[PDB]
């Protein structure tokens, strides 16, 4: 088991985390506004704790450790990252609220409990976005870095830099575009942070409701779609030149993601038209196109409040929230390939009923899927459902009402995280236990459910 070498990496991560507290503390002195005393206190307690772990160890004793690590990287960092939100008495808030905010931030969940953040220090807002960006790194380099410790192909750090480039040249390339449709530079960096990491956080309390310019709506759309799409597939970018074109429409995952996105938009728009929910048949287009992409690709950004929207729409959206993001991107539903495969497998099951003596094979790209991964997919879907209904019960038991707990789980298990059900969205003043529950819910939602579930099987140890 050797947890002794695990702590080395843990402390090393607390220190590596400390050196990112100097980033919104560099905005607590730059932008004259507010208090950055916490960020520099945190940069100290974290560096100290971390180095107090790394130093009494130093042993690179390079499975079950891989798991324990990829639960530590969140459970520890998302706890540590709740430290600025504590000491700072500018948005002075409860400890449980602080944890909710930190975990939701780092997970790229994007569900706030601080109402009235429009008028807060330019640092504590930047910290909020920076967290999302940093976690938005994790969720995609753990689609690479896991392989040595763990298994994706058990069911190379050549690309560790190479991903950070596609990521950086996307957040930058977005920040410019945001500030070209005219946000303040601060608001255009801190919104590219969120829009690339598919997190949902904002500076405005109404998110993408500042300037209803279709410019920014339709920028956020186009950068969400890209960010919501398979960085390993994007990796056909730096390697050779711009020979991107064919690679995308080759992979059937992406090919499916596009059909899904289109169909979803189409029905949404057409219903916003039939119902006369919008004055001009342009705003209908705008709101539909932005909302489907934002809510379904696990983004979270809202540009409306679903006032005239036929109830069928935020519901169908909240459900499509279950499948969002080319696999190995910054999204985090039960990722697109899962649903593709699932539909294939079920279609098969439906075929076997007719001709039962026949040999049917699951086909994705060319080669068939082995009956070890179909099993895994189905098991995953089941587990997913289980987890969802369990946390929904945990919340209804906490005190919350039925529909609200439903929206809550459905929003934290996918990491959306607007209420989205029937206008009961706001987490700030929800029950205190419920907040903890929801934190769990989004840890499950991040870790794809299995890699935490196994942590509490007896079989894991030892």
């Amino acid at each position: 088991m050797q947890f002794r070498s695990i702590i080395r990496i843990v402390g090393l991560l607390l220190a590596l985390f400390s050196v990112t507290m100097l980033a919104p503390a560099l905005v607590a002195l730059l932008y004259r506004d507010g208090a950055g005393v916490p960020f520099v206190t945190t940069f100290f307690v974290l560096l100290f704790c971390g180095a107090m772990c790394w130093f009494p160890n130093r042993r690179h004793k390079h499975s079950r450790d891989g798991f324990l690590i990829v639960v530590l990287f969140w459970t520890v960092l998302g706890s540590a990252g709740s430290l600025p939100f504590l000491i700072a008495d500018n948005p002075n808030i409860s400890v449980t609220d602080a944890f909710f905010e930190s975990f939701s931030a780092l997970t790229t969940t994007g569900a706030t409990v601080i109402v009235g953040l429009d008028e807060l220090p330019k640092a504590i807002l930047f910290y909020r976005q920076f967290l999302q960006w940093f976690g938005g790194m994790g969720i995609i380099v753990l689609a690479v870095a896991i392989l040595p410790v763990l298994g994706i192909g058990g069911m190379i750090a050549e690309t560790a830099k190479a991903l950070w480039y596609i990521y950086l040249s996307l957040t930058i390339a977005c920040a410019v575009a945001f500030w070209l449709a005219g946000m303040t530079p601060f608001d255009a960096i801190s919104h590219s942070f969120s829009t690339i990491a598919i997190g949902g956080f904002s500076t405005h309390d109404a998110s993408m409701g500042y300037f209803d310019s279709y410019a920014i709506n339709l920028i956020t759309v186009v950068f969400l779609l890209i960010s919501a799409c398979n960085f390993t597939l994007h990796f056909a970018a730096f390697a050779s030149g711009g020979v991107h074109p064919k690679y995308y429409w080759k992979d059937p995952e992406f090919r499916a993601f596009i059909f899904i996105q289109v169909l979803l938009f189409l029905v949404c728009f057409l219903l916003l038209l039939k119902h006369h929910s919008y004055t001009s048949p342009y705003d209908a287009f705008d709101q539909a196109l932005f909302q489907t992409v934002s809510i379904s690709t696990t983004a979270g950004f809202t540009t409306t409040g679903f006032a005239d929207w036929p109830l069928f729409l935020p519901v169908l959206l909240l459900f499509s929230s279950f499948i969002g993001g080319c696999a190995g991107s910054t999204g985090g539903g039960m990722k697109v390939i899962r649903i593709l495969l699932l539909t294939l497998q079920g279609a098969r099951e439906l075929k076997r009923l007719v001709h039962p003596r026949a040999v049917y094979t699951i086909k994705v790209g060319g080669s068939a899927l082995p009956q070890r991964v179909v099993d895994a997919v189905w098991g995953f879907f089941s587990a997913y459902a289980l987890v969802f209904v369990v946390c929904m019960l945990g919340l209804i038991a906490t005190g919350m009402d039925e529909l609200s707990a439903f929206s809550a789980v459905a929003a934290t298990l996918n990491n959306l995280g607007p209420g989205l059900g029937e206008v009961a969205l706001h987490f700030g003043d929800v029950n205190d236990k419920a907040k903890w529950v929801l934190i769990v819910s989004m840890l499950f939602g991040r870790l794809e459910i299995f890699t935490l579930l196994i942590l509490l099987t007896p079989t894991f140890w030892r």
Binding site: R357, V359, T361, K363
Partner: protein, 452 residues
């Protein structure tokens, strides 16, 4: 001609057996001597035991003194390497090579006709078999359909079951290409002229344009109802290929006996349903509606299980059955019986090989009924002076005993043979031997003999 045949087994066997019929010097090389013993006993030819791709072995076979290297074995890679070795080490004249793998002849031009892999002609035998079957399918009621000049003229065959009328009187009705090249009544055919009585249960050979053939077939007897649902037993090369082809225009069920073969088959073709199991069990058959199926094609290697499976499938009531029967004696055994059409896969390869053992003046040759008869497409590459055929008319040429001109192809026009038409330079002549042994005459009769 003296030919070296690389590979005894499946194809080299019938190939040798046929080329020995005509007087040639045949030496045949093979991997294991047990396959060699049999033809050594039977057909009086010289045998070479050894790996058919080694220089010393080719030497032992006579690669230096040969006129043709028929490199036809089970393995592609060895066939090719054999042609390579034979060319750069013995300069062996004519190098045909059996290639199975589709992703080789995918670049047929880029890989062989470039002198890179010194193969003169490729010959994919199974492909010939599948094409033959497919044709037999897209022309319901046919017993054999061979097309010649770039699929423009077509010799077709049908049992008389519609007819029963005046021979030259039915030909007028009703606008009209086809003439009867031959009619088998008992064992040998009869002279087909204006005054033949059309008997029942005869095997008739039409020859028309490849366009107006389904049409001739229409005004014939009982244009049979187009096939919808097809079931093939045996998921081998011939089988799986017939599947992969037919699966578009038709609905196809494929039963294969080995699991792994079936399982891999299951992903190799996205439009057919692959069944692992035996071509025998009435259970699976009835369960998959063998009574609602239009044609039952047997294509497993065991001959017995093919014939038997077919007869069983006709008892549980498949409309039609196509059985592949490689041993001739069986083909003769199942004559007047239930089997609708028997496909010998020698008539497919012997035919497409003989096109390369006979000279350039004939471009296509095709073994037919029992193999004793033959049908060829001969070009007339001469002048009114140097050639003895061109310039003359049809009824005026001294054709070998038991031969009949059937059609003539001028560029893209197809002109069926009446006694008056004139043979021109660069014209193709589709004619019909009743006995292949008078083929050297046809060959000589179409060659620019030196008149000086």
């Amino acid at each position: 001609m003296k030919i070296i045949i690389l590979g005894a087994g499946q194809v080299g066997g019938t190939l040798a057996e046929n080329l020995v019929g005509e007087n040639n010097d045949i030496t045949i090389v093979d991997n294991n001597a047990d396959r060699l013993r049999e033809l050594q006993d039977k057909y009086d030819l010289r045998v070479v035991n050894g790996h058919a791709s080694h220089p010393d072995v080719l030497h032992e076979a006579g690669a230096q003194d040969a006129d043709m290297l028929v490199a036809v074995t089970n393995t592609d890679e060895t066939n090719m390497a054999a042609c390579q070795v034979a060319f750069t080490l013995f300069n062996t004249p004519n190098r045909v090579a059996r290639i199975r793998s589709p992703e080789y002849l995918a670049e047929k031009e880029a890989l062989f006709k470039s002198g890179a892999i010194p193969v003169d002609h490729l010959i994919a035998p199974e492909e010939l078999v599948t094409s033959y079957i497919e044709r037999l399918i897209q022309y319901p009621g046919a017993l054999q359909v061979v097309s010649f000049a770039e699929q423009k003229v077509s010799l077709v065959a049908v049992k008389a079951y519609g007819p029963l009328v005046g021979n030259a009187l039915s030909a007028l009705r009703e606008h009209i290409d086809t003439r009867v090249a031959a009619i088998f009544r008992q064992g040998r055919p009869i002279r087909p002229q204006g005054t033949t009585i059309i008997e029942a249960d005869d095997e008739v050979f039409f020859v028309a344009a490849s366009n107006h053939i389904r049409s001739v077939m229409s005004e014939l007897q009982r244009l049979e109802k187009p096939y919808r649902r097809i079931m093939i037993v045996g998921g081998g090369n011939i089988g799986a290929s017939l599947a992969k082809r037919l699966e578009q225009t038709y609905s196809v069920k494929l039963i294969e006996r080995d699991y792994q073969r079936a399982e891999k088959l299951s992903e190799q073709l996205e439009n057919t349903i692959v069944f692992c199991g035996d071509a025998a069990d009435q259970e699976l058959l009835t369960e998959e509606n063998i009574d609602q199926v239009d044609v039952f094609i047997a294509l497993t290697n065991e001959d017995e299980t093919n014939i038997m499976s077919a007869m069983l499938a006709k008892r549980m009531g498949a409309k039609k059955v196509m059985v592949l029967i490689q041993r001739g004696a069986y083909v003769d055994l199942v004559q007047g019986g239930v089997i609708d059409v028997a496909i010998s896969p020698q008539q497919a390869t012997i035919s497409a090989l003989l096109t390369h053992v006979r000279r350039a003046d004939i471009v296509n040759v095709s073994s037919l009924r029992r193999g004793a008869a033959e049908a060829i497409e001969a070009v007339a590459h001469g002048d009114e002076t140097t050639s003895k055929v061109v310039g003359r008319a049809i009824g005026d040429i001294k054709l070998p005993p038991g031969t009949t001109i059937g059609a003539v192809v001028r560029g893209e026009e197809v002109l069926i043979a009446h006694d008056r038409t004139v043979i021109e330079q660069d014209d193709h002549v589709v004619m019909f031997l009743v006995d292949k042994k008078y083929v050297p005459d046809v060959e000589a009769l179409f060659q620019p003999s030196p008149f000086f």
